[PDB]
């Protein structure tokens, strides 16, 4: 078992400095920790924590023996050796001297495989992205038009990401890591012997334990610690630092930041030693100063170089704080700082915020955690009466306006106070719109208006919540069993009380095995006032994982009952009240969301092509927010959100449960520093304890807090008479004052109008953000002209700024989740390729780095082998072969292979049919040299694999072949039926079945087993029945690593389970050794494909051939979509140029013009008009009956019919079968059904954080015409056509472009192209087979509703 919960790669926890100094004092390494620096530690009475963990103590004592043998100085004390024991943060630079490159042969093995890998298909892959570009445009410098400089291949790619600084560091920090886990995996095996690890590398020694490694480096005279944390936040660090300079290097985009984010490391690196972790306070200032850049190019005078300013003022507090530095040192490390980031675009300014996870993370402690927020919450804070009563009068107006616009624009239940003046009354009669400046006035009148019952909300509306896995902590009792057993058993045995039992329960498993569970009455523990009575509650913090920052370095947990009903309140406040407010932007779908703030940022944008619009953002954090939310702000709010709801007590319970509650740190190596404190209600506000919060808690409630915030935001605007719209985010907003200007007015004139005219708002806004309590300070407070921040992304004048460096930065070699399979790891590495194409990186060059980045997966994979296996003949055929890995890495993983990203995912980011993308690029490949003919055969010629019709319905486009599903998510799907298995919960009594699978697959066979197969339709039908629905719910477990270890654990796998989730990667490896290494024998009539083979022809005869025990040759119809790159033969004009297929023949194109003149960042007026560019369409019925506030099911239910009719035939029979597929979810007869179905024409058949999908720097002034075309897949198939114009034509201007000198006509002729089908359907199909007998969650609400109708 513990060979798949193996230790984590990647690091997940915070970095706890106690544990580091637990384990240093625990075996009396060398140290010269002064008494302070252990805090409560050093009293610790060390000698019974030896007489205990003695194999711990053991092997501390084996390592302190052996530096002392290898290091006759480090006996000396007092510190007059001339070695220096250095703690992590003062160990940055001296990072590099550690090479242990003598005695080490992996990492070389490693490098050596990887470069005779990529030397066989770097010449292949430059072929291919010839032949892609020559076919897109007609012309062979697509890619290349930017750069010419150099263009590096794959073998350059590979050379300048193995040759370059930090790659022996990496190598060396691998190999350690390696080690350390293989120890801790023996440790916890109990092997107990040779657990001690030791290289003595000639002028670095380093021991490697379990517990911690100690490394020496002779050249420096420094020797250090690290735990396993440290490791694995090290070793992430330098592998981030490896791949952003080597980006750099490689991307002519990227090129300028190399020498800056060079010099940027060693400056910080020096200061970090220099300093201790007081230098993560100048990396956020860094972080800060970022921005502060991107203002000083702002045209105002009065808003230029104002954060600059400040933000170096706070630069030089930081240095000069602890007298490290004089004020002339510390005036020139702030030059030093700030002269990386001058003479920078806008977009490679806000490309140096790659470097906050640069340099790690501190080492945090908890009395330290504990202090900020002590300080920031539990203070006194004078509140305005009358702001407070502003601000809940334009709530009411805009709570009211919501409702209306809504609900056939009639009022919500309302009662006027006996002061409300005639207008009010006739508008409350009316029920007319509020005019906001109607609000303004008479606000006391506005206000005291008690809103009735509005909606009738349950606490079970949505399941999904209540499925989420959250931290709960231990009652108010058990408070001190998350400390250490050794720390607290001396402080226990003095105080003659019984030890704490430690906590280990989870919220999810709590909700899972409760008997009798219901929300109605779950909710009554804040209804009824319980929870202020419970004497049980407890809440406490934990240090939050890789956080820099002094605020948020914790989070809150909280007992069962109390996250349960946080949890229940949270989603009633965002079901119905907060749909109510469209003030704000925020919506579920990221494309409108997106929309959205393009346009808002396109505002001010008018060309010359009266009055103009102009606008002023203003962006400001919410981070600290939380801590100063006061219960007298918030009880008028939530009083009347109460009685909307109709629950006469749910909100105000954070407050009211805080302060009559203490709360804590919880770290395992933090306790508390005073001994005789065994109880957490006497504590005392200080060390790791928080006495009676007055404040809120980040995260909770924040949808109340965001709708004050929105009703705060508005009331300023109008105070004001200034036009805005807000974007409150939670943890920050954005506000665009909009204002009329004079269209002869110049550029800078019209923006000094716009901030003039801004001011009043900013100075409303801030004297009713004070009034409520939170004061706006320089650092919160952001005004451009030009730009606003949104989910850590900047809208520059239109744009979306590029930030790839921090995507790069996370590109590590191994998936941090549960099965660490290659298929996943490499899965991972082109998400993030995916990613940096859509952050402006070259197209070439992310597909270069994609392929290297897969071959370089798979070679560690092979040559750091993560369990040991008997027998190595598969790993050994691979590693003395290099050509079957380049052939297993190029091959894509719709055939088998490791190649997650396709040549059309370049371009565009909907896919339609993989399989289709994945035949053309094995054809281009075959037409390059990379791969071979005879490697399509044997695709074609493959043996079917152990696949039902099950598989076949629940996941379409999906071939026969074994080992495409990871067997990661085989232990997420294995942890989710554990939980499901032992579930008692009453909301799910009847999702579970024992004979689920066999139910699918029977419901599969008859869906499919048919004259016709349709796949899609079978898809849908599926999840739209019960079983699909079941299915669903299952799914809505998270399947956490501490879900998994329960599931592994209460429910053992089998012994041969065991063995196949260990060896999945050899046995995945040696089943395509079948197909990868040589010729097969294949049929005589598979000769007939070819590569001028159309890819549509040649997936459906894979598709015949691979489901032929299925299917006994019946073909599968339904699925076949063109590929982008082939279905469109493109051609670029420039200037007296014509098009080629418009003169021969082809007369059907996607018109798209780009505009000469465009310059970015420049006058408005001089470039074409700007506007929101095709971004995408989602979904947007003329049912016979709009049945409003229909459930789930009877939706689920309507297009389970609708569908079965439209594929299956519009027959009686057809009907009497969809009936009963129809009636397995909801209780309608023949006669309703039939009425109730929408119109079964035209089907869809569509089924299953912000992340843009380009800049829009040159798409944004594009122009579209498709009036020459015919135009739902034809639908989706010219929206591919116009987004991979799209991307074409901002791929033919990159980044490292900004203007456009000539006018750019694309046209991407579509016709002419063999992947045009004509598209048939609605044919009749039999079943073929009865209906199986399909057993339904009658009692079950959320699957089944016996009355669909009211
Ligand atoms: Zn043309
Ligand atoms: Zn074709």
Known sequence: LNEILLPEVHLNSPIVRYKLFYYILHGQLPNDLEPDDLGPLANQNWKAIRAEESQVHARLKQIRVELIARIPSLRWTRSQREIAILIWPRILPILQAYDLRQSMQLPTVWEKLTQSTVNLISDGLERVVLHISNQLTGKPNLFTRSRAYSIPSTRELSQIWFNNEWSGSVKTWLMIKYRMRQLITNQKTGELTDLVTI??????????????????????????????????????????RLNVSSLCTASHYLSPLKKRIEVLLTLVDDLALLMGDKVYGIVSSLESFVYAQLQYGDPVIDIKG???????????????????????????????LTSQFDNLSPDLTAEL???????????????????????????????????????????????????????????????????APKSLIEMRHDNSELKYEYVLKNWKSISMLRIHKCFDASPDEDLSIFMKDKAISCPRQDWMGVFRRSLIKQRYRDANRPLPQPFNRRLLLNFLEDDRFDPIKELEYVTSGEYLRDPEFCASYSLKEKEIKATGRIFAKMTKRMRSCQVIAESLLANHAGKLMRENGVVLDQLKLTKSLLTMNQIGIISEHGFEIAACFLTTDLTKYCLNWRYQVIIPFARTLNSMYGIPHLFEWIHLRLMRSTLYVGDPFNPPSDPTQLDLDTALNDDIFIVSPRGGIEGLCQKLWTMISISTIILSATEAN????????????????????????????????????????FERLRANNHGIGHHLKEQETILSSDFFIYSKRVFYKGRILTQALKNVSKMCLTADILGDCSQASCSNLATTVMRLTENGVEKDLCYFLNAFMTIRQLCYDLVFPQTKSLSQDITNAYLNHPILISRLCLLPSQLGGLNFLSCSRLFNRNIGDPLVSAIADVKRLIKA????????????????????????????????????????????????????????????????????????????????????????????????????????????????????????????????????????????????????????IVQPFLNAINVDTCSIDIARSLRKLSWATLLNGRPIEGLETPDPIELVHGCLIIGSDECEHCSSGDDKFTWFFLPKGIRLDDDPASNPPIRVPYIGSKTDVASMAYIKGASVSLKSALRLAGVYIWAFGDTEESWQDAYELASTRVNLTLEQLQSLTPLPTSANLVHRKFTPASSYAFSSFVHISNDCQILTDSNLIYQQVMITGLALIETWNNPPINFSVY????????????????????????????????????????????????
């Not at 199986?1332 to 109708?1349: C, G, T």
């Open 929 to 1080: 040299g990379c791969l071979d003919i005879w490697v399509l055969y044997n695709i074609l010629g493959r043996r079917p694999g152990k696949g039902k019709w099950s598989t076949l319905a629940a996941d379409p486009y999906t071939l026969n072949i074994d080992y495409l599903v990871p067997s990661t998510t085989f232990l997420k799907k294995h942890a989710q039926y554990t939980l499901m298995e032992r579930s008692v919960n009453p909301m799910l009594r009847g999702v579970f079945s024992e004979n689920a699978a066999e139910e699918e697959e029977e419901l599969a066979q008859y869906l499919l087993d048919r004259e016709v197969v349709m796949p899609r339709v079978a898809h849908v039908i599926l999840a739209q029945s019960s079983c699909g629905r079941r299915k669903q719910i299952q799914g809505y477990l998270d399947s956490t690593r501490t879900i998994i270890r329960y599931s592994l654990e209460v429910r053992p796998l089998s012994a041969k389970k065991l063995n196949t989730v260990i060896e999945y990667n050899l046995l995945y490896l040696s089943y395509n050794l079948e197909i990868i290494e040589k010729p097969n």
């Open 722 to 761: 200034t036009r805005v719209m807000s974007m409150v985010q939670g943890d920050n907003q954005a506000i665009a004052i909009t204002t009329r200007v004079v269209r002869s007015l110049s550029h800078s004139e019209k923006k000094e109008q716009a901030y003039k005219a801004s001011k009043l708002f």
């Open 1303 to 1350: 006018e750019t006509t694309l046209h991407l002729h579509t016709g002419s192209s063999c992947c045009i089908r004509p598209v048939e359907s609605c044919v009749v199909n039999p079943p073929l087979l009865p209906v199986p007998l399909i057993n339904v969650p009658q009692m079950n609400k959320f699957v089944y509703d016996p009355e669909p109708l009211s």
């Open 199 to 240: 290289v003595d590398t000639r002028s670095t020694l380093c021991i490697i334990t379990p517990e911690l490694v100690a490394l020496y480096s002779s050249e420096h005279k420094a020797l250090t610690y690290l735990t396993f944390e440290m490791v694995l936040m090290v070793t992430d660090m330098l592998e981030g």
């Open 306 to 336: 104002t954060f600059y300013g400040f933000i170096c003022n706070e630069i030089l507090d930081l240095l000069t704080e602890d007298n490290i530095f004089t004020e002339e040192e510390a005036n020139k490390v702030l030059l030093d």
């Open 353 to 419: 915020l790659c470097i906050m996870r640069l340099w790690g993370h501190p080492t945090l402690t908890a009395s330290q955690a504990a202090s900020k927020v002590r300080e920031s919450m539990c203070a006194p804070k004078v509140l305005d009466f009358q702001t407070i009563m502003k601000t809940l009068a334009f709530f009411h107006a805009i709570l009211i306006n919501g409702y209306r616009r809504s609900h056939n624009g009639i009022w919500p239940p309302t009662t006027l106070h006996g002061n």
